[PDB]
Amino acid sequence: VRSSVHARWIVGKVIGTKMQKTAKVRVTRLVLDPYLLKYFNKRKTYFAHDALQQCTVGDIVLLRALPVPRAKHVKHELAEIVFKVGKVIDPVTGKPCAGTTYLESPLSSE
Amino acid sequence: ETKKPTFMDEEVQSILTKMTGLNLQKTFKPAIQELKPPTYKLMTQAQLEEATRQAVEAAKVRLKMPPVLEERVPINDVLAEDKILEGTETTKYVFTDISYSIPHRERFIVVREPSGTLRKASWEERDRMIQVYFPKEGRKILTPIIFKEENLRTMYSQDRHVDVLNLCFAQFEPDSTEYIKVHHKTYEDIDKRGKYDLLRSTRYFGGMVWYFVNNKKIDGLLIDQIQRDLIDDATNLVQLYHVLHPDGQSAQGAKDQAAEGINLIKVFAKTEAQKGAYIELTLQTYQEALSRHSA
Amino acid sequence: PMKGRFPIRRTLQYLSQGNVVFKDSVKVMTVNYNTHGELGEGARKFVFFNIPQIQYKNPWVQIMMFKNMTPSPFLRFYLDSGEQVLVDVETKSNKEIMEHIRKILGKNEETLREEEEEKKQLSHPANFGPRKYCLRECICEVEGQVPCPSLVPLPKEMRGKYKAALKA
Amino acid sequence: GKATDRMDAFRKAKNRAVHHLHYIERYEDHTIFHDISLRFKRTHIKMKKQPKGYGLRCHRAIITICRLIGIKDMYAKVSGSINMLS
RNA sequence: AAUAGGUUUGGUCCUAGCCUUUCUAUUAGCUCUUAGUAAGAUUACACAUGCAAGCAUCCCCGUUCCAGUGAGUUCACCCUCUAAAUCACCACGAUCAAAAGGGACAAGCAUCAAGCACGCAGCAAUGCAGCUCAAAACGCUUAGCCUAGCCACACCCCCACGGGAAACAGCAGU
Numbered sequence: 142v143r144s145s146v147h148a149r150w151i152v153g154k155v156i157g158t159k160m161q162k163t164a165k166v167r168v169t170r171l172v173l174d175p176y177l178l179k180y181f182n183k184r185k186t187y188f189a190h191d192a193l194q195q196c197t198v199g200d201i202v203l204l205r206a207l208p209v210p211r212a213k214h215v216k217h218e219l220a221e222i223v224f225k226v227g228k229v230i231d232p233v234t235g236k237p238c239a240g241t242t243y244l245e246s247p248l249s250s251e
Numbered sequence: 252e253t254k255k256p257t258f259m260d261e262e263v264q265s266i267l268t269k270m271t272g273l274n275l276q277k278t279f280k281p282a283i284q285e286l287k288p289p290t291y292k293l294m295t296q297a298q299l300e301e302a303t304r305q306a307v308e309a310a311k312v313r314l315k316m317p318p319v320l321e322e323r324v325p326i327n328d329v330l331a332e333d334k335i336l337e338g339t340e341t342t343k344y345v346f347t348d349i350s351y352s353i354p355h356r357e358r359f360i361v362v363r364e365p366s367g368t369l370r371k372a373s374w375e376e377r378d379r380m381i382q383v384y385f386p387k388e389g390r391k392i393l394t395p396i397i398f399k400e401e402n403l404r405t406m407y408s409q410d411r412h413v414d415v416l417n418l419c420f421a422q423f424e425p426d427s428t429e430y431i432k433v434h435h436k437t438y439e440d441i442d443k444r445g446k447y448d449l450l451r452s453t454r455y456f457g458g459m460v461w462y463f464v465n466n467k468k469i470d471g472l473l474i475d476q477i478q479r480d481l482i483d484d485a486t487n488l489v490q491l492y493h494v495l496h497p498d499g500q501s502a503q504g505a506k507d508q509a510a511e512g513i514n515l516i517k518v519f520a521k522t523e524a525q526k527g528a529y530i531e532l533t534l535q536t537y538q539e540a541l542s543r544h545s546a
Numbered sequence: 547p548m549k550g551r552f553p554i555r556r557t558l559q560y561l562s563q564g565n566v567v568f569k570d571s572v573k574v575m576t577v578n579y580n581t582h583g584e585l586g587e588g589a590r591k592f593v594f595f596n597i598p599q600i601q602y603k604n605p606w607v608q609i610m611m612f613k614n615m616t617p618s619p620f621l622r623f624y625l626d627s628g629e630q631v632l633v634d635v636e637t638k639s640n641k642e643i644m645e646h647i648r649k650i651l652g653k654n655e656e657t658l659r660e661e662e663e664e665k666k667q668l669s670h671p672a673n674f675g676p677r678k679y680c681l682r683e684c685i686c687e688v689e690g691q692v693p694c695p696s697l698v699p700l701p702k703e704m705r706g707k708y709k710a711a712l713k714a
Numbered sequence: 715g716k717a718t719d720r721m722d723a724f725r726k727a728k729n730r731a732v733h734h735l736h737y738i739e740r741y742e743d744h745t746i747f748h749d750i751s752l753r754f755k756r757t758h759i760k761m762k763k764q765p766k767g768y769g770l771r772c773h774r775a776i777i778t779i780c781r782l783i784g785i786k787d788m789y790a791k792v793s794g795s796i797n798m799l800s
Numbered sequence: 801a802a803u804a805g806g807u808u809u810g811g812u813c814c815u816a817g818c819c820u821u822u823c824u825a826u827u828a829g830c831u832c833u834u835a836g837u838a839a840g841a842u843u844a845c846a847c848a849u850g851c852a853a854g855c856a857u858c859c860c861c862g863u864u865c866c867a868g869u870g871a872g873u874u875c876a877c878c879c880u881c882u883a884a885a886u887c888a889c890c891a892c893g894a895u896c897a898a899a900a901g902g903g904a905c906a907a908g909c910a911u912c913a914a915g916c917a918c919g920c921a922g923c924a925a926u927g928c929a930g931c932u933c934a935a936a937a938c939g940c941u942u943a944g945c946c947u948a949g950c951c952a953c954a955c956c957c958c959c960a961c962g963g964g965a966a967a968c969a970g971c972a973g974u
C-alpha cells in the first residue's frame with residue numbers, strides 16, 4: 142500500500158495519447174488566492190501508464206500511484222475511465238446519456 | 252446508620268439554589284472592561300422568551316456553587332535523608348515535575364534541604380510552584396496585600412464582599428487555610444452588618460448559609476428573609492437547620508408539634524434562636540401586612 | 547465595495563465556518579452538477595457556497611467540478627482504499643448535501659476535539675523561550691525570582707566585576 | 715456666509731445656520747444608531763457606531779460638528795474628494 | 801496609505817502627482833554627568849605578531865564540532881525508502897538523520913516567446929516521435945532565507961586528482 146509517489150489518487154482529463162502505453166492527463170486542483178480569498182483552478186500534467194491504450198483524448202480518468210515510478214515522468218497508472226468522452230454512463234441510474242438527456246430511459250428496465 | 256448531609260447532596264444543593272435566587276440583571280451586570288459595539292437581533296415574542304430562557308441556563312452555570320472543603324492537612328513526609336550532603340549547599344532545591352498531563356494534586360514536588368533531606372514540598376510551596384510553571388489567570392505567586400486584615404475592612408466598608416470572594420477564589424485553593432480564613436471573615440462581616448443581599452444571585456450565597464447553619468447563627472439571615480417577604484426561603488432555612496442538627500431542641504419541637512410552614516420559624520424562634528424575640532416581632536409584622544393585603 | 551455577488555464567500559470568517567472535515571480516507575471529491583433545472587438547484591448552491599468551505603478545511607483533497615455531463619447532479623468520493631462513494635444530490639438543498647457528506651465521510655466532533663487537545667501539548671506553559679513559542683522568555687519574568695539586570699542592577703556582591711576585585 | 719469683510723461673513727453664516735437646524739438622533743445620547751456609509755458627490759464618509767469611551771476618532775471637522783450635535787463616541791473615515799462643504 | 805494636512809486656478813469643482821505630520825536604523829554636524837544591561841568593520845580586499853585542539857599506559861578517539869562569513873543561491877520543508885550514529889553488546893525495535901525517489905518552495909523583466917532532445921514503450925534487440933511552454937517554458941538580472949533557527953560558503957579554478965598560488969569570512973589586532 143506504501144508508495145514513493147506523492148499523489149496517490151487523482152482525477153484528470155486525458156489531453157494526449159501520442160506516447161505508447163502512456164496517457165497525458167491534466168489534473169486540476171482548487172488553490173486559494175491569498176489576497177482575493179477566491180479559489181482558482183491550478184492545472185498539472187501527469188503521465189499515466191495505459192497498458193491497453195484504451196484512453197481517448199477528452200475522457201475523465203482516475204489515476205492510481207505506482208509503487209515506484211516506471212519512467213522519469215510516469216508515476217501513475219490508469220485505474221479507471223470515469224467518463225468516456227461522448228459515451229458517458231449515468232452513475233446514478235446506470236443508463237447512457239448525452240449531456241443532460243438520457244439516451245435510454247430509466248423506465249425501460251423499471 | 253444515619254449520615255448527616257454533605258454540601259453537595261442534591262437535597263441541600265436544591266435548597267441552597269433556591270435561597271440564592273437568580274436575578275439576570277445582577278448576575279449579568281455590565282462589566283467595566285474593553286468594549287465592542289453591540290449586536291442587534293429582530294425577535295418575536297417567542298424568540299425573545301427562548302433567548303431569555305438560554306440566559307437563565309447560562310446564569311445557573313455562572314451560579315454553580317464551589318464545593319465546601321475542609322482544611323488540607325499539612326504535608327510532612329520525608330523521602331530520604333542523605334546525610335552525606337549535609338553542609339554541601341547553602342540553599343535548598345525545589346524540584347517540580349512539570350509533565351503536562353498530570354493533575355496538580357498528583358504532581359510530585361520535592362525539596363532537597365541543605366541538611367540533605369529529600370522531603371515533599373509543603374502545601375504552600377506546592378501552590379506557589381504550580382503557579383510558577385502552570386500560571387493560572389488571576390493568581391499571583393506572592394500573596395496580594397489585599398488579604399491583610401486592614402485591607403479587607405476597606406473592602407467591607409465599600410460593600411465589596413463579592414470582590415473579596417472572587418479574589419480569594421482566584422488566589423487560593425478551596426481547601427487552603429487562607430481560603431477558609433478569608434471566607435469566614437467575610438461571612439462574619441455580613442452577619443454583623445446584615446448584608447446578606449450582597450451575595451444573593453451569586454455562587455457564594457450557599458457557602459455563606461452552610462457556614463451559618465453549621466455554626467448555629469442563622470438568626471440574622473432568617474430575619475433578613477422575613478423582612479424581604481421570602482418566607483419560602485426562611486422556612487427552608489429552618490428546615491435545613493433541622494436536617495443538619497437533628498438532635499436539637501428545635502428539631503424535636505417541630506416533630507412533637509408537627510410544625511409546617513411559618514410554624515417552623517415560631518418553634519425555632521423559641522427553642523434555639525438567640526434573637527427569639529426579634530424574630531417573633533419581625534414575623535408578627537409580616538403576618539399583619541399579609542392580612543391587610545388579603546383584606 | 548468587494549466585487550461580485552455574495553462577497554462574504556471571500557472572507558476568512560466565512561471559509562472557517564465549514565463543518566465538513568473529511569476522514570483521511572477521502573482523496574478526491576468530484577462534483578457533477580447541472581447549470582439549469584429546478585431539481586439541480588441545491589447542487590448549484592452547494593458549488594456556489596460550500597465547495598469553498600470544503601476545500602478550505604480539506605486543502606489536500608482534490609475537488610473537481612463537471613458541468614452538464616449527466617442528467618442529474620451527484621457527488622462521488624474516491625477513498626484511499628479504492629472504494630467509491632456515490633451521493634445523489636438531486637432535489638436536495640445545499641444544507642442537506644453538507645449534512646449528508648458530513649455524516650458519511652466527515653469527522654465527528656469528538657475526533658476533532660481530541661486533535662485540538664493533542665495540539666495544546668506542543669506548547670507547554672512551563673517552557674521558556676521566544677514569545678513566538680513560549681509564554682515567558684526567562685525565569686526573571688517570574689515574580690520572586692532575581693530580576694533581569696537590565697531593569698534592576700544586581701548587588702555588587704553578585705557581580706563578577708567586584709568578586710574578582712576583592713579576590714584579586 | 716459671504717461678504718467683503720470677514721466679520722460680516724461670520725455674522726451671516728452663524729445667524730442663518732440657526733434657521734436650518736437638523737435634528738440628529740443619538741443612541742443613548744452618545745453615538746449613532748447604526749453604521750452609516752454614504753457618498754455625497756465625490757466625498758465618501760463611512761461612520762461606525764461605537765461604545766462609550768471610544769471617543770471621536772474622525773476627521774477634525776467631523777469632530778467639531780459631532781461636539782455641536784452631542785455625539786461622543788464614533789469612528790469615521792473620509793475617502794474621495796475631501797471638500798469641507800461636501 | 802491616516803482622523804488627515806499643504807500645494808495646480810483670476811476663481812470654483814474634479815482628477816492627479818509631490819511634499820508635511822508618525823515610527824525605526826545608519827551616517828554627519830554641534831553637544832554630553834553616573835550606574836546597570838543589550839548591541840557593536842563599510843568591504844568574500846590584503847594581512848605583521850600571538851593565541852584559538854587536545855586527550856590518553858602507547859591503540860584509538862577528537863581536531864568533520866564549536867566559532868566565522870553572506871560570496872553564491874529555490875540542496876532548508878513534508879512523504880517514501882534506507883545507511884552511518886545513540887540506546888554497554890543484540891533490540892528484527894525506538895530515537896536521530898544522509899544519499900536516492902515523489903511533492904512543495906524568492907523578487908523583477910515577456911523589449912527573455914519559443915526551448916532544442918528537453919519524451920515514451922520494450923527483458924533485450926530496437927521501435928515510436930515525442931517532451932516543456934503566454935495558466936509564462938527557456939533566458940537575463942537582483943537577493944542569504946520562511947530567524948528557538950536554517951541554507952550556503954570556508955583564498956581562487958562551482959568541485960579540488962591537479963593547477964594558480966601560500967590564504968584571520970576563529971579571537972585580539974593592522
Ligand code: FES
Pocket residue numbers: 684685686687693694695696
Ligand atoms: S532576560 Fe532574564 S535575566 Fe535578562
Ligand SMILES: [K+]
Pocket residue numbers: none
Ligand atoms: K493632493
Ligand SMILES: [K+]
Pocket residue numbers: none
Ligand atoms: K559613528
Ligand SMILES: [K+]
Pocket residue numbers: 870944
Ligand atoms: K549571501
Ligand SMILES: [K+]
Pocket residue numbers: none
Ligand atoms: K566555492
Ligand SMILES: [Mg+2]
Pocket residue numbers: 808
Ligand atoms: Mg489645471
Ligand SMILES: [Mg+2]
Pocket residue numbers: 809
Ligand atoms: Mg486659467
Ligand SMILES: [Mg+2]
Pocket residue numbers: none
Ligand atoms: Mg550622531
Ligand SMILES: [Mg+2]
Pocket residue numbers: none
Ligand atoms: Mg556554525
Ligand SMILES: [Mg+2]
Pocket residue numbers: none
Ligand atoms: Mg553584500
Ligand SMILES: [Mg+2]
Pocket residue numbers: none
Ligand atoms: Mg544502522
Ligand SMILES: [Mg+2]
Pocket residue numbers: none
Ligand atoms: Mg535527502
Ligand SMILES: [Mg+2]
Pocket residue numbers: none
Ligand atoms: Mg526532492
Ligand SMILES: [Mg+2]
Pocket residue numbers: 911
Ligand atoms: Mg529595448
Ligand SMILES: [Mg+2]
Pocket residue numbers: none
Ligand atoms: Mg549577494
Ligand SMILES: [Mg+2]
Pocket residue numbers: 955
Ligand atoms: Mg581572507
